[PDB]
């Protein structure tokens, strides 16, 4: 049911997030690397029949050598019938043949195992496949569902080998009890249930748990992260990610504190999911976009791309001027295949009405990034001007200018997006919340001084902004007017006095 | 500082939310009933000489018969010095002169004590005096401070007695510790801590905490619930409020679960107290701004209004199909004294594009309120027209009229506001944001048929939403152009057939 004689692609596909080239895409699923083959595997809810949501539905699968150029396979798993779906889940990699599945042709890096939830009309259950060919073609197993507790309502597993207790972990939500349950096995086939779990922002329901040691940064040590999706009932409005920092035992996790944080503060990150097999750290993405208005964005012919791929550590980082709390951390992967078209670097700028930054670029890929250290210098103005601005400018196209704007207000202590585009109209706009903020701390002080930084990128229709050398993430969608995209940069202020010192400025045109 | 040369009150001073008459209001202080004098006591943090936050800082007050006719009076508390101030604060009636300030000349249930911090120069200390003329004039004690811990984070203490452990319990915020500090004393003079509370969502430092006793609809049963105020660092961005719901036995407050949930999910509901001495139920309110902007918006001779009084009850109501969550619920205060000048009344209402709901008022007092039981049918339409919208209009003044728009969406089973007002411009607008949404449940089923309410007050320049007879409630200002207030309400659909059955519609137009 696609109409594909209308495609946007030229003026609002992303180059470097993964989008399906055609039909529906939302949560990410059966993330791993591949050491044998040296591949990252990207799997997602996939229905290439429309772009909106709907059954039959299935793992589609894409690989990666770098985390930003995809190429995408053919579908991996699918339904035994049209009105049931391969809900979200996750891939293990079983070395050591706990599952009887692998013989000694498959190679122990290769031994793949996918983990998910099978949706049928008044049934939700786990079900497993292994794969033999590195991860395109899987076989179910023969005795699913693995786990069946007779709900409709139970979904979403992520599963991880866990050393100390010498099991398999499942994480999965019972999805409206508000509860993450904790299951054990040896093998993937028998599970026992180990523990409940249930914390911070409820909403309408538990989606998509993960739980994975995460590093403390300059550290040997780590903690245990709990991660949670919740839709709707987000406090920003739809779905949304939060997280909880503890230990695990292999049975229960404890959370250090009862205190509620969310991983992205944009509006359009959703269903996290961490990749299976890094070697160094934990690297994860997420579905960009919000189920309020999700299947009625104007792409076409697909909808939806994921993230960035994202580093993630703790860190203890002041939350307010007299207190430090280990706080979740996360950083772009950004590596060195991708092309620099064009770069503006300044130093050491004192910012003014009369000195703003603009971008003087030939032409324009829509792929942009900003990487802005600044100081708030000790200059008292008019309320109206405590803020500078980067703004995101289109070409003019039919005699206009689209803009998205991101700031900061040094009385606010306080980064914002407005993503509102004038005359770009699409169904439940009224859900397309325009303008967010995030407050921190200084990243530092020089004398008494407040230092900051931003980095952000804008890739044709995604915007991801990390604050602080990755302290706060933000991700957000935007939607320019037909054949318009992100062609220049500026940095303004109407201070007539710099109030803002940019240390360092490099803004860079990107390409694939 | 104050220019009473402009005066917006015309089209934008609240008619029965209170207001200072000019100069600068925030947080609500010293909340209590006079029994005796058949009174309602308004304190609040009051800075005379600016429409801006400043020293010295002093409780103004304000008295009312019925909670929404206010007479303003002589300033009740005051610093020592210009670069000090009288912080947030409550009162008690110590009935049986625990103090000792109290002789058989002054009635028990106007034994008035104001518990309330001293903020100096590097030093916040709580402190307390009393009042020998039923709360008009304050004495302060000899001996104060009464709680001294070397800080400059410790603030707002709530008192309340405690009849079960027969003694004077005080939350107070250790506010960038992220502790809310349980105190108890005999007389009000000597404090002994007792437990701390840490839990919820952080934001930069925790503020106004409040403890008591809420009763559960159709029962005889009640729990303790904790109130705390955060700011900045709401999830909405700037200052919010949140609660706990639990037990308490004098000494430490027991959360029944470790969930996060907001008070009021609108941007503009911050630093809520309860007033002491309400014979039947919790009655409390706010200050009905956010600290992002509260000292921007386009109001002169003064800034800041409360919210109404509202009435808090506990009930368990359904956040998702299956499961019941026992949930803060809040509906105004509004008397008989409010007089109802006109009014449109509908019932059965199939509405449709050709069908729209009109108020035709002969002249407007910019004081409305809307009662909304609503049905959704089973009818498919195109995913732009799942929708109908509350348009509250100004009149047309140099031929333009001005709307804020309260929605609800059937796809999303959530209602949303858009305050978006175009050419209105004031500084730190960036954190003004316009689009709010609320999820919900079905209020009830008839048959198949999911049934909502909707309860809306506009008043100039503030709306209070409640939904589903106040399962959800959400405060948020608006201003109008110059000269601009509300002058009619419409209620519309682009649905060709009816998706919305309005079982019952009632608008009024009020007056004090
Ligand atoms: C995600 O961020 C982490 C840093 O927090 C990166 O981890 C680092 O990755 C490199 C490999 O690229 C590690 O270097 C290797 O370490 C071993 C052992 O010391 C050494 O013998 C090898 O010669 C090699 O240099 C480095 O140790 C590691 N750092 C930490 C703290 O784990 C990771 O690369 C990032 N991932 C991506 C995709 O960006
Ligand atoms: C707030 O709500 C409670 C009901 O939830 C009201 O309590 C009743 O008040 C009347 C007297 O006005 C008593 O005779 C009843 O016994 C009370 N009922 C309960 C269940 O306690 C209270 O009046 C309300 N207050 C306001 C101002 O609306
Ligand atoms: O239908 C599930 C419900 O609408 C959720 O809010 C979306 O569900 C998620 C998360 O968005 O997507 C998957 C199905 O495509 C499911 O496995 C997962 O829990
Ligand atoms: O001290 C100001 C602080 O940063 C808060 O965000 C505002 O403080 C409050 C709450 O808004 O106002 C009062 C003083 O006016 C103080 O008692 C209370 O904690
Ligand atoms: C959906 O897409 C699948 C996979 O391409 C295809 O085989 C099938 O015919 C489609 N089903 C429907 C209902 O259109
Ligand atoms: C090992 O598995 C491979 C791949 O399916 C299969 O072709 C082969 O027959 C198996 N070998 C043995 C010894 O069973
Ligand atoms: C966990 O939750 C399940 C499903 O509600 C319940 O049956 C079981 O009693 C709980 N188990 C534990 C260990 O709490
Ligand atoms: C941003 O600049 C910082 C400081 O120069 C640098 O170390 C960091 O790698 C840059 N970030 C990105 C995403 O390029
Ligand atoms: C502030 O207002 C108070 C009370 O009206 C008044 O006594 C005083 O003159 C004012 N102080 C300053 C510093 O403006
Ligand atoms: C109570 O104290 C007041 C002064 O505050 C005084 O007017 C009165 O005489 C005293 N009454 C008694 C009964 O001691
Ligand atoms: C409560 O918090 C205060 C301030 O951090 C601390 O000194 C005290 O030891 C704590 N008391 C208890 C009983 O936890
Ligand atoms: C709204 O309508 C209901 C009847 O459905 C009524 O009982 C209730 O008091 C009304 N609320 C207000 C605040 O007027
Ligand atoms: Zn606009």
Same mark, same amino acid.
């Not at 035994?80 to 009105?83: A, C, K, R, T």
């Not at 599945?101 to 498959?106: A, E, L, Q, V």
């Not at 991983?263 to 509006?267: A, E, L, P, W």
């Given at each position: 049911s696609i109409d594909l004689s209308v495609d946007t692609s030229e003026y609002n596909r992303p180059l470097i997030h993964f989008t399906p080239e055609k039909g529906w895409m939302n949560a990410p699923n059966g993330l791993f690397y591949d050491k044998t083959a040296k591949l990252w595997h990207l799997y997602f809810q996939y229905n290439?029949?429309?772009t909106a949501w709907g059954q039959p539905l299935y793992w589609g699968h894409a690989t990666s050598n770098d985390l930003v150029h995809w190429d995408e396979h053919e579908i991996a798993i699918g339904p035994?019938?049209?009105?049931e779906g391969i809900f979200s889940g996750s891939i293990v990699v079983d070395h050591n043949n706990t599952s009887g599945?692998?013989?000694?042709?498959?190679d122990p890096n290769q031994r793949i195992v996918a983990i998910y939830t099978n949706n049928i009309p008044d049934n939700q259950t786990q079900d497993i496949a292994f794969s033999?060919?590195?991860?395109?073609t899987f076989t179910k197993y023969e005795?699913?569902?693995?786990?069946?507790?007779? +709900? /409709?309502?139970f979904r979403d597993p992520k599963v991880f080998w866990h050393e100390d207790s010498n099991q398999w972990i499942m994480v999965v939500s019972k999805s409206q009890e508000y509860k993450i349950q904790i299951f054990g096995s040896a093998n993937l086939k028998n599970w026992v249930l180990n523990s409940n779990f249930s914390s911070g922002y409820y909403g309408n329901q538990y989606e998509c748990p993960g739980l994975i040691e995460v590093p403390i940064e300059n550290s040997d040590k780590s903690k245990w992260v709990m991660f949670l999706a919740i839709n709707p009932?987000?406090?920003?409005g739809g779905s949304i990610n939060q997280y909880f920092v503890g230990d695990f035992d292999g049975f229960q996790f404890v959370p250090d504190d009862s205190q509620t944080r969310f991983?992205?503060?944009?509006?359009d990150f959703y269903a996290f999911q961490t990749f299976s097999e890094v070697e160094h750290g934990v690297l994860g993405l997420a579905?960009? +976009? /919000?189920?309020?208005y999700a299947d009625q964005?104007?792409?076409?012919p697909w909808r939806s791309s994921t993230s960035l791929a994202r580093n993630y550590t703790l860190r203890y980082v002041h939350?307010?001027?007299?207190t430090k709390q280990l706080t979740l951390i996360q950083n772009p992967v950004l590596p060195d295949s991708i092309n620099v078209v064009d770069k503006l670097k300044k130093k050491n700028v004192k910012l003014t009405n009369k000195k703003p930054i603009k971008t003087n670029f030939?032409?324009?890929?829509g792929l942009f990034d900003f990487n802005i250290t600044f100081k708030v210098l000790n200059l008292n103005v008019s309320?109206?001007?405590?803020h500078f601005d980067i703004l995101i400018n289109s070409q003019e196209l039919n005699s206009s200018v689209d803009s998205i704007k991101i700031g900061f207000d040094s009385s606010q202590s306080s980064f914002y997006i407005d993503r509102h585009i004038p005359n770009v109209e699409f169904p439940r706009?009224?859900?397309?919340?325009?303008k967010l903020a995030a407050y921190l701390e200084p990243l530092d002080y020089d004398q008494d001084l407040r230092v900051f930084s931003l980095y952000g990128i804008v890739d044709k229709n995604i915007i991801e902004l990390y604050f602080n050398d990755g302290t706060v993430a933000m991700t957000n969608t935007f939607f320019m007017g037909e054949g318009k995209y992100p062609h220049d940069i500026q940095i303004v202020t109407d201070?007539?006095?710099?109030?803002?010192?940019?240390?360092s400025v490099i803004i860079r045109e990107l390409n694939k």
């Open positions: 290439p029949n429309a035994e019938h049209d009105n599945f692998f013989n000694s042709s498959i033999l060919d590195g991860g395109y005795n699913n569902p693995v786990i069946d507790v007779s +709900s /409709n309502q009932g987000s406090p920003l991983v992205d503060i944009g509006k579905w960009a +976009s /919000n189920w309020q964005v104007p792409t076409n939350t307010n001027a007299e030939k032409g324009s890929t309320p109206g001007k405590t706009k009224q859900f397309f919340t325009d201070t007539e006095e710099p109030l803002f010192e940019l240390e």
